[PDB]
Amino acid sequence: RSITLGNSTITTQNVVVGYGVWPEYLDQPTQPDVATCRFYTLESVQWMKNSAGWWWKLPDALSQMGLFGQNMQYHYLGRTGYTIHVQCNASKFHQGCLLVVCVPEAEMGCSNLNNTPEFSELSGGDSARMFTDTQVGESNAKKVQTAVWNAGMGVGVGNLTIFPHQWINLRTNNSATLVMPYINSVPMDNMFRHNNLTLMIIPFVPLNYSEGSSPYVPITVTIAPMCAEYNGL
């Protein structure tokens, strides 16, 4: 309860950590920790009745977020870990179920069968791109095939529990918490041409309420980088 990092404080009360490992450290690298280890809270999305899902690219969403956006442009390489706090606040009269996954290397596929999706359609800088429950038409310029039941990666959406995940069931639970290490083939990689993670939120059992209750449940995603180190003189 009331954990603080740097000059920011959140409030909690179960945490699932990575693939079993805690994030730790390793020309020579420099290790900054004061101006990066803090809670960057993204703005809140609205979960309505006919919602489909959201996704963020993780070393892209904090690209304009304070001094962490300055270390992405001034330094060439770098490696980070993450600590993702998801919490949605609903009353006892609402119902639903979310699935919160953190997929490493989520290569997505274009709607046009010959091209690859362009840069603005894969990742929004601290703004969630959204799923659909239909198909996206092929004859357009360039967009992501974002049918939710195939998760945009050509794979059955029920089997997405093999990646490190956590359930948010509004009957019993309220929040999720993930701690993710650095998973890449090279020990230190570029932070502009590569997104090594992907945070997905998919409503399996959709929201329901009676007439009179508030028709939306806001979700709040709070990310804090752990054990970051860069490469420079």
Partner: antibody, heavy 119, light 107 residues
């Protein structure tokens, strides 16, 4: 939250150029695309063209050579231009933003500037 | 491209009936459909998108159903503010083509 609005020339001579500017408010052009819809009393509604959020455009087939839609992310404005302006273009022109929850539908529309092409 | 044939062209009802407006596509669009309502001399408003889902502030009287090439919209109980023009649009592929249009007189 307040949304987009436009300002146009009002009326043109035949075989002249038309240029309307739709200026937005409260959202960015890096997250949405803007469609251009023409409401006609004779042929009904028709979709003229669109500029996507990446900068790519896609125009109608019948109005391909005459149209050109461009935008600027910084000053938050979209310019479109139609040329040679025959007699059938007596209509009202709307600008409306797309990507309503990622479904490519029109969220909210401009006020519309009706044009008259005759002398 | 693909044409949307909307039927009927006009209707004349009172307050409180069940009406049904259908529009049929030339080929399959995979539920990529939007429904609009335009009043007298104003900008049209989004009513039902993706052929089932309701809009943000649209009341729960409206309903859309259909899949494939056949779609429909229903109002269970009319009110005084529910007449005007209604159009259907596919957003499956460019070029997007609107429907013909229907009118409610509320006699």
């Amino acid at each position: 939250q307040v949304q987009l609005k436009q300002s146009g020339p009002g009326l043109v001579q035949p075989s002249q150029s038309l240029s309307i500017t739709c200026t937005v408010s409260g959202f960015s052009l890096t997250n949405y695309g803007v469609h251009w819809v023409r409401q006609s009393p004779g042929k009904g509604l028709e979709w003229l063209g669109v500029i996507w959020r990446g900068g790519s455009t896609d125009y109608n087939a019948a109005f391909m050579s005459r149209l050109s839609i461009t935008k600027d992310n910084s000053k938050s404005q979209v310019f479109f231009k139609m040329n040679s302006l025959q007699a059938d273009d007596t209509a009202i022109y709307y600008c409306a933003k797309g990507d309503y929850y990622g479904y490519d539908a029109m969220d909210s529309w401009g006020q519309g500037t009706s044009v008259t092409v005759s002398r | 491209d693909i044409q949307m044939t909307q039927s009927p062209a006009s209707l004349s009802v009172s307050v409180g009936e069940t009406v049904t407006i259908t529009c049929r596509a030339s080929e399959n669009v995979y539920r990529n459909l939007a429904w609009y309502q335009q009043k007298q001399g104003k900008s049209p408003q989004l009513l039902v998108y993706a052929a089932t889902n309701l809009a943000d502030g649209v009341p729960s009287r409206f309903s859309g159903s259909g899949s494939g090439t056949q779609y429909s919209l229903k109002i269970n109980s009319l009110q005084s503010e529910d007449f005007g023009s209604y159009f259907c649009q596919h957003f499956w592929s460019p070029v997007f083509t609107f429907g013909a249009g229907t009118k409610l007189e509320l006699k």
